[PDB]
């Protein structure tokens, strides 16, 4: 395309000025790498510039170190490996090029967490994303490609049984009353407004072929063609982490089966696990967490220090959303185990703090 004209200029003329930028890509991409990599492309249509587009478009933040790049398809992880290996390694804490990643949604490996104390655990939630092999990712796919994915999802979702039975809504033509119902339950989403998303082009043609499906019990939610291909969220008020994890697993187990019956499968390989858009969601792409009533620990001086070692993320709300801080190098259910462990520790931490007791004896050297 217009890249042919790019090839008429010296690499340094094309080389973007990342001086004011602060992200993982920015530290990784050098003039030397740019000069080399700009000559390569994927069979799907990617070129270095699109890989680093969002990056150069957004310096990001002086404190929040975003990734600064985005993948295009499965092949692009190999084609632009010379950046991804440095970016992935840095973003995921030393994840090496030969560090085999595993997978495991078998609920039998989750110990305890049958009932977290409901005095603290307001609610539990599990979230992930999957991409369908054979298609490209949202930053690149055409209208036709996007539409095909929608249809596949609609078919599979229409066949889920039991509690996984539900209804599909077509975002582009859903009724305002329906919008009211789904916005109240926060199942309704809308066009991306962050410049960190818009720079990728994921909003192209919106709302064409964007879709919402949820089950009858409002515990199983999936979004179609949004931030990534299939966005899956399982949730339930209460502290029953064990059951929610299982529900989630059976959701993906049946959906994968249904796709396999049509010769489709999720993008996956032994090295990066599940293949998604941004680098931060490689491997498991699994997030899990809870809403905990911690008015006490939220004021304690070492709260963030404890969470740091527990490898948990601290987030507010639209009381804390405590969640899995890792994505790659851990066996899915293993990460859920980490969340259960940390939360129970925090509950006890809070118990002692509530009673005015020293809490130093509950601060393990977790790394």
């Amino acid at each position: 395309s217009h890249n042919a004209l790019k090839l008429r200029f010296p690499a340094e003329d094309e080389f973007p000025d990342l001086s004011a930028h602060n992200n993982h890509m920015a530290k990784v991409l050098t003039p030397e790498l740019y000069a080399e990599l700009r000559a390569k492309s994927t069979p799907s249509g990617f070129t270095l510039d699109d890989v680093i587009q969002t990056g150069v478009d957004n310096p990001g933040h002086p404190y929040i170190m975003t990734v600064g790049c985005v993948a295009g398809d499965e092949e692009s992880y190999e084609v632009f490996k010379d950046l991804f290996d440095p970016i992935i390694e840095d973003r995921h804490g030393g994840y090496k090029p030969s560090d085999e990643h595993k997978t495991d949604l078998n609920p039998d490996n989750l110990q305890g967490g049958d009932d977290l104390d409901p005095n603290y655990v307001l609610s539990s939630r599990v979230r992930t994303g999957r991409s369908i092999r054979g298609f490209c990712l949202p930053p690149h796919c055409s209208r036709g490609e996007r539409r095909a994915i929608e249809k596949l999802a609609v078919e599979a979702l229409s066949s889920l049984d039991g509690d996984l039975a539900g209804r599909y809504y077509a975002l582009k033509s859903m009724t305002e009353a329906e919008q009211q119902q789904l916005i109240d339950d926060h199942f309704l989403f809308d066009k991306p407004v962050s410049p960190l998303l818009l720079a990728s082009g994921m909003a192209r043609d919106w709302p064409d072929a964007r879709g919402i499906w949820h089950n009858d019990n409002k515990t199983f939610l999936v979004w179609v063609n949004e931030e990534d291909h299939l966005r899956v969220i399982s949730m339930q008020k209460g502290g029953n982490m064990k059951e929610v994890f299982t529900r989630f697993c059976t959701g993906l187990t049946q959906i994968e089966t249904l796709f396999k019956s049509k010769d489709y499968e999720f993008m996956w390989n032994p090295h990066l696990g599940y293949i998604l858009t941004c680098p931060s969601n490689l491997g498991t792409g699994l997030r899990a967490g809870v809403h905990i009533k911690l008015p006490n620990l939220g004021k304690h001086e070492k709260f963030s220090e404890v969470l740091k070692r527990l490898r948990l993320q601290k987030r507010g709300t639209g009381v804390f959303d405590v969640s899995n801080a890792d994505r790659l190098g851990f066996s899915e259910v293993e990460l859920v185990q980490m969340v259960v462990d940390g939360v129970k520790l925090l509950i006890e931490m809070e118990q002692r703090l509530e009673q005015g007791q020293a809490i130093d004896d509950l601060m393990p050297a977790q790394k």
Partner: protein, 270 residues
């Protein structure tokens, strides 16, 4: 934007947050004219104002405040616009925010503007906070006092400023006075200041140790402590007593005392 999208924090910025953190004033105005309200917040209750304060973008906070931004809004980490301004150091924003009602004192003890400025070396912001109405000797658990913190980070500019303002030279963290802190950090420069402002060389820390006992005898400080082991001069005592009659930052009134300029300077340069 408008709801718990249950996505990553990276996906929740408004265009205003982006404009705010990088100083895109006209863009900000344009977004406002489209209808992006200034009180739109994200995940941790972070407003454009909070980001603008971190960036130090004075004109942006003027605009945001002009349109009703919450000058005392509190984030999930207990941060306020004022606190954030102190973090960046923006002297102008600190003044402005205070003029619009920013409380010098924070609700949470995890984020004191004064203590932050003390650690950063933001002397003129310390000045403004105190002058506006800030407790220069506020003791806050893990951080002790502003003075103590300045000493911990070797912020001699703030140390001198605070002590002249009237910081309690002998009040640090727990039993660890600022003087003990200097001994631990081996600073002859800060030692000289603290001694001159009335630091107690015989005070004991939690371990029952005097500042001189917290530093190796081979150091210059050992000699410096020896110089002040005996009783202080009468003039020293007088100066200390005189200074006690003035409040925080009120010692400028010393210039009105009926006495020789030499002594006036002696008192003013405490």
């Amino acid at each position: 934007l408008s709801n718990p999208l249950m996505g990553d924090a990276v996906s929740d910025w408004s265009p205003m947050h982006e404009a705010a953190i990088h100083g895109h004033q006209l863009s900000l105005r344009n977004l406002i004219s489209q209808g992006w309200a200034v009180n739109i917040i994200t995940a941790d209750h972070v407003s454009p104002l909070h980001e603008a304060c971190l960036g130090g973008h004075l004109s942006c906070v003027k605009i945001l405040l002009k349109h009703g931004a919450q000058v005392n809004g509190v984030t999930a980490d207990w941060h306020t616009p004022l606190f954030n301004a102190c973090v960046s150091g923006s002297w102008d924003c600190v003044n402005l925010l205070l003029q619009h009602g920013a409380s010098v004192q924070p609700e949470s003890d995890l984020a004191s503007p004064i203590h932050e400025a003390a650690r950063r070396g933001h002397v003129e912001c310390v000045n403004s906070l105190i002058a506006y109405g800030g407790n220069i000797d506020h003791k806050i658990s893990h951080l002790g006092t502003p003075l103590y913190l300045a000493c911990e980070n070797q912020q001699r500019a703030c140390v001198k400023k605070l002590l002249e303002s009237g910081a309690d030279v002998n009040q640090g963290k727990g039993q660890d006075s600022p003087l003990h802190a200097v001994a631990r950090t081996a600073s002859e420069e800060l030692a000289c200041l603290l001694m001159d402002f009335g630091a107690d060389t015989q005070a004991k820390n939690a371990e029952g140790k005097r500042p001189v006992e917290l530093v190796p005898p081979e150091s210059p400080l050992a000699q410096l402590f020896l110089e002040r082991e005996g009783p202080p001069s009468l003039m020293q005592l007088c100066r200390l007593r005189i200074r006690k009659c003035f409040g925080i930052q009120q010692h400028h009134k010393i210039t009105k005392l009926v006495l020789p300029e030499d002594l006036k300077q002696f008192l003013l340069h405490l």
